[PDB]
Amino acid sequence: APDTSVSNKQNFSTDVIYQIFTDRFSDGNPANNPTGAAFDGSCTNLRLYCGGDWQGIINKINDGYLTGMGITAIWISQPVENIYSVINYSGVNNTAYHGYWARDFKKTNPAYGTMQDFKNLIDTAHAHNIKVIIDFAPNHTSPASSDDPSFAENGRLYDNGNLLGGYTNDTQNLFHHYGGTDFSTIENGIYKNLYDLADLNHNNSSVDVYLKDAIKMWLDLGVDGIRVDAVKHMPFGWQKSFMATINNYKPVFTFGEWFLGVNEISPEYHQFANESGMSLLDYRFAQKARQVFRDNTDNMYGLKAMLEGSEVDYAQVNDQVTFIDNHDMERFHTSNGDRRKLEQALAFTLTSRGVPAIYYGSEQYMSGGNDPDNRARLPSFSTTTTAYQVIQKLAPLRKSNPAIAYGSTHERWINNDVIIYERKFGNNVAVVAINRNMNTPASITGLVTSLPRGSYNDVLGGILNGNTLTVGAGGAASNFTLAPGGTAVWQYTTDATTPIIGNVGPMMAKPGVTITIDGRGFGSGKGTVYFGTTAVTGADIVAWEDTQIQVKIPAVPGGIYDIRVANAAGAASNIYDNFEVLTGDQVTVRFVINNATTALGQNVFLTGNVSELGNWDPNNAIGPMYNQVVYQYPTWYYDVSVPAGQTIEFKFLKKQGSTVTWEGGANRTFTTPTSGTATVNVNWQP
Ligand SMILES: C[C@H]1O[C@H](O[C@H]2[C@H](O)[C@@H](O)[C@H](O)O[C@@H]2CO)[C@H](O)[C@@H](O)[C@@H]1N[C@H]1C=C(CO)[C@@H](O[C@H]2O[C@H](CO)[C@@H](O)[C@H](O)[C@H]2O)[C@H](O)[C@H]1O
Ligand SMILES: OC[C@H]1O[C@@H](O)[C@H](O)[C@@H](O)[C@@H]1O
Ligand SMILES: OC[C@H]1O[C@H](O)[C@H](O)[C@@H](O)[C@@H]1O
Ligand SMILES: OC[C@H]1O[C@H](O)[C@H](O)[C@@H](O)[C@@H]1O
Ligand SMILES: [Ca+2]
Ligand SMILES: [Ca+2]
């Protein structure tokens, strides 16, 4: 299939995602609406159910509202059955309209629809070449008080109707009972409850296996992507085995939400995108795009620096989901904000690297503050707003122009208010010029691009006041004045003669799994895929065509590999690095070490003999381990994804700066379970 196919569930850079709060989009079936205190048909109480459902999204795909816009992926509210309680928080009544308060991950939320409505949504979306991404929130079930078992549904978790347990009298320890987080540390935020949500205990084998069985069920129903909620609040080791479960079973594009505020750059955030096996919502892009295009607290140099810097800091920048607002931010468009600002920011996101996500109602200029006011019902389904037309013209370029789906980003002209950047992938080029100043025209002189000579028409058709670009010899453009608020997109596409890899998904899997390599110039005839210097040819290449290769990961040792393609003619591609071949299936094991006293700045880490534990390398050791919530110093603990069903050797070490102190004695051995979790409780060997 080509890279742009609806069946490419592994990579979404050629897609434009439309993020839908199911309840707030279209009530296509009023018979499934909540009744009583849980429902507000006027949707003026934004914490109640307004009635929107999966039949409503089907109707909007069918009648061309979503497809007219060029949307090729929808991201909907978590589909699982939620609690039915209307919770009163100091006066306001609150319901599970948002899908985040699960009670059964194997059943649907009936307000949204039946399991048959879900399959009809999947099939209708696919028949219209729309991929379906669902939220999945495995961190917690629902508001619970162990002190008051009658509050809400006491966080109860059911397994396809069968009650597993609740928060009060949790003798099985399905949940964490350490109090609520104050967000002071990542550890604190992981093992304590978010607010009052009953925190699931992923170290409990029943919880571990249940959530992994539940995600496989939704993958069996044909979902094409997963947005994981609260990745900052679950153990990294468990989420890496969770990702290995998905990737070793049916790999689909998975990204998580790790919130970053304005100007916050976090190494942990970047480590998570680079090493977890899922990508992230690109809050670094979103916050800077809002600073430059919305709030004017930064200028185009800030924008250039984020684009240049993010291309390096994210190992796979083409997998990051970009957006200018979403459910956790005030809407981009303000009451007194010029609409041109929204239209430019959307033109910027749609032509930028990564996977653009448009929050529902952006095209209808919805404004609103923070939750719940950014989740109002969308007011109109008008197909003629300028913002609808901006998405309609630019979203198709993700499928048709590989420079926009995969290309590098090159700033070609800039000043405080104007950026002209170029996306390049082989000989495919897109050039985007944006003047954010709504008053001053920009005189552009000396612009050089990679466009062949010609008179390029603005793909936006002058609707954001763009113009034709005349390109002469050597990509030099004839000088022009960029209008106040002007935005223009110029492009050139042609065939790639060289194999060029633009994206690979999944990026972590065991031997035997088929990965998807997308790009251009692979040719029709089966060539060679290199994992390191290991050639994979012939029958292990499951599919080969010019834009997409599907190949089985060879049985190489676990570790990180560069991928490279050589077409049938021996021409080799660029290297696509950081592929992790896992040692096998994964299980999360909790390692607990007692009596590991440390100095200030000295932390305990774990390493061992499998790639998953850094292969005995102190620079790649797992940690720093935790030592405050589940166990307290000098006992340290950490949840680590390790190969299932085997004896690993490992040792703990203390690291402070450059100094590694290994524990003495013989290497430790442990035989990991085949599924479920295990705890290793040991004592520091001096
Ligand atoms: C729990 C959230 O924590 C992080 O995001 C926060 C961030 O820390 C704040 O500084 C920022 O101002 O707001 C964000 C949202 O609260 C984390 O990175 C996020 O992934 C995470 N937000 C998720 C999770 C939930 C579950 O609580 C959603 O909230 C919903 O639940 C509450 C109470 O249970 C309901 O009353 C709300 O109506 C729901 O939105 C977040 O919206 C979701 O984005
Ligand atoms: O500073 C690193 C470590 O040093 C210890 O002295 C301290 O008691 C621990 O709580 C800390 O994690
Ligand atoms: O008035 C606004 C209401 O919104 C929130 O849900 C608060 O929890 C609640 O206590 C407050 O009174
Ligand atoms: O057998 C004990 C030895 O095992 C491991 O290879 C450790 O790397 C080493 O530092 C330790 O001293
Ligand atoms: Ca309904
Ligand atoms: Ca948690």
PDB file of N, CA and C in Angstrom, residues 211-285:
ATOM      1  N   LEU A 211      -5.254  -4.310  31.337  1.00  0.00           N
ATOM      2  CA  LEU A 211      -5.115  -3.146  30.478  1.00  0.00           C
ATOM      3  C   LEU A 211      -4.442  -3.502  29.167  1.00  0.00           C
ATOM      4  N   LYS A 212      -3.519  -4.469  29.178  1.00  0.00           N
ATOM      5  CA  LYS A 212      -2.900  -4.950  27.960  1.00  0.00           C
ATOM      6  C   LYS A 212      -3.899  -5.765  27.152  1.00  0.00           C
ATOM      7  N   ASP A 213      -4.733  -6.607  27.773  1.00  0.00           N
ATOM      8  CA  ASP A 213      -5.811  -7.286  27.067  1.00  0.00           C
ATOM      9  C   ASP A 213      -6.833  -6.301  26.527  1.00  0.00           C
ATOM     10  N   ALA A 214      -7.162  -5.243  27.260  1.00  0.00           N
ATOM     11  CA  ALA A 214      -8.119  -4.237  26.818  1.00  0.00           C
ATOM     12  C   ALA A 214      -7.592  -3.496  25.603  1.00  0.00           C
ATOM     13  N   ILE A 215      -6.335  -3.055  25.563  1.00  0.00           N
ATOM     14  CA  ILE A 215      -5.851  -2.339  24.388  1.00  0.00           C
ATOM     15  C   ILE A 215      -5.808  -3.255  23.179  1.00  0.00           C
ATOM     16  N   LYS A 216      -5.473  -4.527  23.339  1.00  0.00           N
ATOM     17  CA  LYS A 216      -5.517  -5.437  22.230  1.00  0.00           C
ATOM     18  C   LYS A 216      -6.926  -5.568  21.680  1.00  0.00           C
ATOM     19  N   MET A 217      -7.957  -5.547  22.523  1.00  0.00           N
ATOM     20  CA  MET A 217      -9.324  -5.636  22.061  1.00  0.00           C
ATOM     21  C   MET A 217      -9.646  -4.440  21.167  1.00  0.00           C
ATOM     22  N   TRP A 218      -9.262  -3.220  21.545  1.00  0.00           N
ATOM     23  CA  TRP A 218      -9.536  -2.059  20.731  1.00  0.00           C
ATOM     24  C   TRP A 218      -8.721  -2.086  19.459  1.00  0.00           C
ATOM     25  N   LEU A 219      -7.526  -2.652  19.464  1.00  0.00           N
ATOM     26  CA  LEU A 219      -6.726  -2.811  18.262  1.00  0.00           C
ATOM     27  C   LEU A 219      -7.399  -3.833  17.377  1.00  0.00           C
ATOM     28  N   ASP A 220      -8.020  -4.865  17.939  1.00  0.00           N
ATOM     29  CA  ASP A 220      -8.792  -5.808  17.164  1.00  0.00           C
ATOM     30  C   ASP A 220     -10.027  -5.198  16.547  1.00  0.00           C
ATOM     31  N   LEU A 221     -10.582  -4.138  17.132  1.00  0.00           N
ATOM     32  CA  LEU A 221     -11.729  -3.473  16.543  1.00  0.00           C
ATOM     33  C   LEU A 221     -11.310  -2.535  15.407  1.00  0.00           C
ATOM     34  N   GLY A 222     -10.012  -2.411  15.099  1.00  0.00           N
ATOM     35  CA  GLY A 222      -9.518  -1.674  13.934  1.00  0.00           C
ATOM     36  C   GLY A 222      -9.102  -0.247  14.184  1.00  0.00           C
ATOM     37  N   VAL A 223      -8.864   0.171  15.435  1.00  0.00           N
ATOM     38  CA  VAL A 223      -8.429   1.537  15.655  1.00  0.00           C
ATOM     39  C   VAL A 223      -7.041   1.673  15.026  1.00  0.00           C
ATOM     40  N   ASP A 224      -6.700   2.903  14.635  1.00  0.00           N
ATOM     41  CA  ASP A 224      -5.453   3.117  13.915  1.00  0.00           C
ATOM     42  C   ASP A 224      -4.419   3.871  14.710  1.00  0.00           C
ATOM     43  N   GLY A 225      -4.787   4.370  15.873  1.00  0.00           N
ATOM     44  CA  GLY A 225      -3.865   5.130  16.670  1.00  0.00           C
ATOM     45  C   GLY A 225      -4.414   5.218  18.075  1.00  0.00           C
ATOM     46  N   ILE A 226      -3.568   5.576  19.046  1.00  0.00           N
ATOM     47  CA  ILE A 226      -3.930   5.640  20.455  1.00  0.00           C
ATOM     48  C   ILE A 226      -3.295   6.887  20.997  1.00  0.00           C
ATOM     49  N   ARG A 227      -4.069   7.699  21.709  1.00  0.00           N
ATOM     50  CA  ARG A 227      -3.506   8.824  22.394  1.00  0.00           C
ATOM     51  C   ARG A 227      -3.593   8.411  23.858  1.00  0.00           C
ATOM     52  N   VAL A 228      -2.428   8.290  24.484  1.00  0.00           N
ATOM     53  CA  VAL A 228      -2.334   7.910  25.877  1.00  0.00           C
ATOM     54  C   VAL A 228      -2.290   9.162  26.740  1.00  0.00           C
ATOM     55  N   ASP A 229      -3.262   9.104  27.643  1.00  0.00           N
ATOM     56  CA  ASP A 229      -3.475  10.109  28.646  1.00  0.00           C
ATOM     57  C   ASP A 229      -2.466   9.955  29.783  1.00  0.00           C
ATOM     58  N   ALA A 230      -1.991  11.092  30.305  1.00  0.00           N
ATOM     59  CA  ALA A 230      -1.196  11.178  31.528  1.00  0.00           C
ATOM     60  C   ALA A 230       0.048  10.303  31.599  1.00  0.00           C
ATOM     61  N   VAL A 231       0.854  10.352  30.537  1.00  0.00           N
ATOM     62  CA  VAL A 231       2.086   9.569  30.476  1.00  0.00           C
ATOM     63  C   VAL A 231       3.136   9.971  31.520  1.00  0.00           C
ATOM     64  N   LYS A 232       3.044  11.204  32.027  1.00  0.00           N
ATOM     65  CA  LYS A 232       3.893  11.723  33.097  1.00  0.00           C
ATOM     66  C   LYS A 232       3.542  11.075  34.452  1.00  0.00           C
ATOM     67  N   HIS A 233       2.376  10.430  34.496  1.00  0.00           N
ATOM     68  CA  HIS A 233       1.809   9.920  35.728  1.00  0.00           C
ATOM     69  C   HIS A 233       1.742   8.421  35.851  1.00  0.00           C
ATOM     70  N   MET A 234       2.418   7.717  34.966  1.00  0.00           N
ATOM     71  CA  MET A 234       2.499   6.279  34.990  1.00  0.00           C
ATOM     72  C   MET A 234       3.968   5.967  34.923  1.00  0.00           C
ATOM     73  N   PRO A 235       4.414   4.846  35.487  1.00  0.00           N
ATOM     74  CA  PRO A 235       5.811   4.442  35.473  1.00  0.00           C
ATOM     75  C   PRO A 235       6.273   4.324  34.024  1.00  0.00           C
ATOM     76  N   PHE A 236       7.414   4.907  33.649  1.00  0.00           N
ATOM     77  CA  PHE A 236       7.983   4.786  32.306  1.00  0.00           C
ATOM     78  C   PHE A 236       8.190   3.317  31.967  1.00  0.00           C
ATOM     79  N   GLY A 237       8.674   2.504  32.899  1.00  0.00           N
ATOM     80  CA  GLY A 237       8.927   1.117  32.613  1.00  0.00           C
ATOM     81  C   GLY A 237       7.657   0.382  32.253  1.00  0.00           C
ATOM     82  N   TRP A 238       6.550   0.669  32.941  1.00  0.00           N
ATOM     83  CA  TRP A 238       5.317  -0.016  32.592  1.00  0.00           C
ATOM     84  C   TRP A 238       4.830   0.441  31.223  1.00  0.00           C
ATOM     85  N   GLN A 239       4.876   1.746  30.937  1.00  0.00           N
ATOM     86  CA  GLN A 239       4.423   2.228  29.643  1.00  0.00           C
ATOM     87  C   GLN A 239       5.311   1.688  28.546  1.00  0.00           C
ATOM     88  N   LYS A 240       6.616   1.458  28.717  1.00  0.00           N
ATOM     89  CA  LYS A 240       7.414   0.818  27.681  1.00  0.00           C
ATOM     90  C   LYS A 240       6.974  -0.632  27.474  1.00  0.00           C
ATOM     91  N   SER A 241       6.531  -1.413  28.478  1.00  0.00           N
ATOM     92  CA  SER A 241       6.071  -2.771  28.225  1.00  0.00           C
ATOM     93  C   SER A 241       4.698  -2.696  27.607  1.00  0.00           C
ATOM     94  N   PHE A 242       3.886  -1.707  27.978  1.00  0.00           N
ATOM     95  CA  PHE A 242       2.603  -1.459  27.362  1.00  0.00           C
ATOM     96  C   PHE A 242       2.822  -1.199  25.860  1.00  0.00           C
ATOM     97  N   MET A 243       3.751  -0.315  25.481  1.00  0.00           N
ATOM     98  CA  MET A 243       4.073  -0.057  24.081  1.00  0.00           C
ATOM     99  C   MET A 243       4.597  -1.285  23.386  1.00  0.00           C
ATOM    100  N   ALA A 244       5.433  -2.105  24.026  1.00  0.00           N
ATOM    101  CA  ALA A 244       5.881  -3.352  23.431  1.00  0.00           C
ATOM    102  C   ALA A 244       4.735  -4.301  23.204  1.00  0.00           C
ATOM    103  N   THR A 245       3.679  -4.278  24.037  1.00  0.00           N
ATOM    104  CA  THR A 245       2.510  -5.126  23.850  1.00  0.00           C
ATOM    105  C   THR A 245       1.825  -4.698  22.588  1.00  0.00           C
ATOM    106  N   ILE A 246       1.602  -3.412  22.383  1.00  0.00           N
ATOM    107  CA  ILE A 246       0.959  -2.894  21.192  1.00  0.00           C
ATOM    108  C   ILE A 246       1.824  -3.201  19.975  1.00  0.00           C
ATOM    109  N   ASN A 247       3.096  -2.846  20.019  1.00  0.00           N
ATOM    110  CA  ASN A 247       3.965  -2.975  18.878  1.00  0.00           C
ATOM    111  C   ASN A 247       4.252  -4.395  18.505  1.00  0.00           C
ATOM    112  N   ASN A 248       4.289  -5.293  19.470  1.00  0.00           N
ATOM    113  CA  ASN A 248       4.584  -6.657  19.122  1.00  0.00           C
ATOM    114  C   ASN A 248       3.318  -7.367  18.738  1.00  0.00           C
ATOM    115  N   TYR A 249       2.160  -6.721  18.891  1.00  0.00           N
ATOM    116  CA  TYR A 249       0.896  -7.340  18.528  1.00  0.00           C
ATOM    117  C   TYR A 249       0.354  -6.739  17.231  1.00  0.00           C
ATOM    118  N   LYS A 250      -0.131  -5.513  17.260  1.00  0.00           N
ATOM    119  CA  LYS A 250      -0.634  -4.849  16.083  1.00  0.00           C
ATOM    120  C   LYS A 250      -0.130  -3.418  16.208  1.00  0.00           C
ATOM    121  N   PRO A 251       1.037  -3.022  15.663  1.00  0.00           N
ATOM    122  CA  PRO A 251       1.601  -1.699  15.912  1.00  0.00           C
ATOM    123  C   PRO A 251       0.752  -0.575  15.340  1.00  0.00           C
ATOM    124  N   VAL A 252       0.324   0.416  16.110  1.00  0.00           N
ATOM    125  CA  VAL A 252      -0.441   1.505  15.547  1.00  0.00           C
ATOM    126  C   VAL A 252       0.260   2.724  16.105  1.00  0.00           C
ATOM    127  N   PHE A 253       0.106   3.870  15.458  1.00  0.00           N
ATOM    128  CA  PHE A 253       0.683   5.119  15.915  1.00  0.00           C
ATOM    129  C   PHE A 253       0.235   5.453  17.325  1.00  0.00           C
ATOM    130  N   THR A 254       1.127   5.594  18.305  1.00  0.00           N
ATOM    131  CA  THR A 254       0.683   5.890  19.649  1.00  0.00           C
ATOM    132  C   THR A 254       1.388   7.129  20.116  1.00  0.00           C
ATOM    133  N   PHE A 255       0.691   8.103  20.682  1.00  0.00           N
ATOM    134  CA  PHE A 255       1.359   9.244  21.256  1.00  0.00           C
ATOM    135  C   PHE A 255       0.751   9.538  22.609  1.00  0.00           C
ATOM    136  N   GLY A 256       1.511  10.132  23.513  1.00  0.00           N
ATOM    137  CA  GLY A 256       1.027  10.459  24.824  1.00  0.00           C
ATOM    138  C   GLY A 256       0.967  11.951  25.087  1.00  0.00           C
ATOM    139  N   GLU A 257       0.320  12.319  26.180  1.00  0.00           N
ATOM    140  CA  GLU A 257       0.283  13.701  26.572  1.00  0.00           C
ATOM    141  C   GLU A 257       1.158  13.931  27.794  1.00  0.00           C
ATOM    142  N   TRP A 258       2.164  14.790  27.712  1.00  0.00           N
ATOM    143  CA  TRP A 258       3.047  15.160  28.793  1.00  0.00           C
ATOM    144  C   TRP A 258       2.955  16.664  28.606  1.00  0.00           C
ATOM    145  N   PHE A 259       2.247  17.370  29.498  1.00  0.00           N
ATOM    146  CA  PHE A 259       2.039  18.805  29.374  1.00  0.00           C
ATOM    147  C   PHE A 259       3.330  19.570  29.565  1.00  0.00           C
ATOM    148  N   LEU A 260       3.615  20.590  28.761  1.00  0.00           N
ATOM    149  CA  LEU A 260       4.751  21.465  28.990  1.00  0.00           C
ATOM    150  C   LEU A 260       4.153  22.846  28.968  1.00  0.00           C
ATOM    151  N   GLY A 261       4.570  23.685  29.906  1.00  0.00           N
ATOM    152  CA  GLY A 261       4.109  25.055  29.920  1.00  0.00           C
ATOM    153  C   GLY A 261       5.005  25.853  29.002  1.00  0.00           C
ATOM    154  N   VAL A 262       4.699  27.132  28.957  1.00  0.00           N
ATOM    155  CA  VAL A 262       5.410  28.122  28.166  1.00  0.00           C
ATOM    156  C   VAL A 262       6.874  28.125  28.582  1.00  0.00           C
ATOM    157  N   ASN A 263       7.754  28.038  27.590  1.00  0.00           N
ATOM    158  CA  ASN A 263       9.201  28.071  27.776  1.00  0.00           C
ATOM    159  C   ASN A 263       9.736  26.951  28.638  1.00  0.00           C
ATOM    160  N   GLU A 264       8.924  25.946  28.954  1.00  0.00           N
ATOM    161  CA  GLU A 264       9.400  24.818  29.718  1.00  0.00           C
ATOM    162  C   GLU A 264       9.966  23.833  28.723  1.00  0.00           C
ATOM    163  N   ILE A 265      11.203  23.467  28.958  1.00  0.00           N
ATOM    164  CA  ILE A 265      11.784  22.392  28.201  1.00  0.00           C
ATOM    165  C   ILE A 265      12.311  21.513  29.322  1.00  0.00           C
ATOM    166  N   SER A 266      11.974  20.272  29.063  1.00  0.00           N
ATOM    167  CA  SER A 266      12.192  19.209  29.994  1.00  0.00           C
ATOM    168  C   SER A 266      12.938  18.127  29.247  1.00  0.00           C
ATOM    169  N   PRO A 267      14.068  17.671  29.805  1.00  0.00           N
ATOM    170  CA  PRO A 267      14.848  16.524  29.363  1.00  0.00           C
ATOM    171  C   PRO A 267      14.049  15.256  29.505  1.00  0.00           C
ATOM    172  N   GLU A 268      13.308  15.050  30.598  1.00  0.00           N
ATOM    173  CA  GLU A 268      12.468  13.879  30.788  1.00  0.00           C
ATOM    174  C   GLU A 268      11.419  13.755  29.722  1.00  0.00           C
ATOM    175  N   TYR A 269      10.824  14.865  29.316  1.00  0.00           N
ATOM    176  CA  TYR A 269       9.823  14.880  28.262  1.00  0.00           C
ATOM    177  C   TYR A 269      10.444  14.358  26.967  1.00  0.00           C
ATOM    178  N   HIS A 270      11.612  14.919  26.640  1.00  0.00           N
ATOM    179  CA  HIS A 270      12.319  14.491  25.450  1.00  0.00           C
ATOM    180  C   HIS A 270      12.759  13.050  25.568  1.00  0.00           C
ATOM    181  N   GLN A 271      13.267  12.574  26.720  1.00  0.00           N
ATOM    182  CA  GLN A 271      13.622  11.173  26.950  1.00  0.00           C
ATOM    183  C   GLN A 271      12.435  10.257  26.712  1.00  0.00           C
ATOM    184  N   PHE A 272      11.265  10.661  27.202  1.00  0.00           N
ATOM    185  CA  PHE A 272      10.058   9.894  27.015  1.00  0.00           C
ATOM    186  C   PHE A 272       9.750   9.786  25.519  1.00  0.00           C
ATOM    187  N   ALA A 273       9.735  10.872  24.730  1.00  0.00           N
ATOM    188  CA  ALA A 273       9.433  10.762  23.287  1.00  0.00           C
ATOM    189  C   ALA A 273      10.433   9.904  22.518  1.00  0.00           C
ATOM    190  N   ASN A 274      11.678   9.982  22.973  1.00  0.00           N
ATOM    191  CA  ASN A 274      12.758   9.285  22.307  1.00  0.00           C
ATOM    192  C   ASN A 274      12.881   7.861  22.722  1.00  0.00           C
ATOM    193  N   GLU A 275      12.441   7.479  23.916  1.00  0.00           N
ATOM    194  CA  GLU A 275      12.701   6.131  24.381  1.00  0.00           C
ATOM    195  C   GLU A 275      11.506   5.345  24.800  1.00  0.00           C
ATOM    196  N   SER A 276      10.295   5.894  24.867  1.00  0.00           N
ATOM    197  CA  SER A 276       9.219   5.092  25.396  1.00  0.00           C
ATOM    198  C   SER A 276       8.638   4.135  24.424  1.00  0.00           C
ATOM    199  N   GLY A 277       8.725   4.487  23.141  1.00  0.00           N
ATOM    200  CA  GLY A 277       8.099   3.699  22.105  1.00  0.00           C
ATOM    201  C   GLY A 277       6.851   4.420  21.629  1.00  0.00           C
ATOM    202  N   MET A 278       6.441   5.537  22.218  1.00  0.00           N
ATOM    203  CA  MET A 278       5.316   6.307  21.706  1.00  0.00           C
ATOM    204  C   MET A 278       5.855   7.722  21.469  1.00  0.00           C
ATOM    205  N   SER A 279       5.209   8.531  20.637  1.00  0.00           N
ATOM    206  CA  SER A 279       5.668   9.881  20.466  1.00  0.00           C
ATOM    207  C   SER A 279       4.848  10.769  21.397  1.00  0.00           C
ATOM    208  N   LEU A 280       4.926  12.089  21.279  1.00  0.00           N
ATOM    209  CA  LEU A 280       4.226  12.956  22.182  1.00  0.00           C
ATOM    210  C   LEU A 280       3.477  14.028  21.464  1.00  0.00           C
ATOM    211  N   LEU A 281       2.506  14.587  22.159  1.00  0.00           N
ATOM    212  CA  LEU A 281       1.874  15.797  21.689  1.00  0.00           C
ATOM    213  C   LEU A 281       2.984  16.822  21.888  1.00  0.00           C
ATOM    214  N   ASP A 282       3.263  17.555  20.837  1.00  0.00           N
ATOM    215  CA  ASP A 282       4.340  18.498  20.816  1.00  0.00           C
ATOM    216  C   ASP A 282       3.939  19.821  21.437  1.00  0.00           C
ATOM    217  N   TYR A 283       3.909  19.816  22.760  1.00  0.00           N
ATOM    218  CA  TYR A 283       3.649  21.015  23.514  1.00  0.00           C
ATOM    219  C   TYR A 283       4.734  22.040  23.338  1.00  0.00           C
ATOM    220  N   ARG A 284       5.965  21.632  23.042  1.00  0.00           N
ATOM    221  CA  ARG A 284       7.024  22.584  22.808  1.00  0.00           C
ATOM    222  C   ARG A 284       6.698  23.413  21.563  1.00  0.00           C
ATOM    223  N   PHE A 285       6.210  22.773  20.492  1.00  0.00           N
ATOM    224  CA  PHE A 285       5.766  23.467  19.299  1.00  0.00           C
ATOM    225  C   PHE A 285       4.547  24.301  19.627  1.00  0.00           C
TER     226      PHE A 285
END
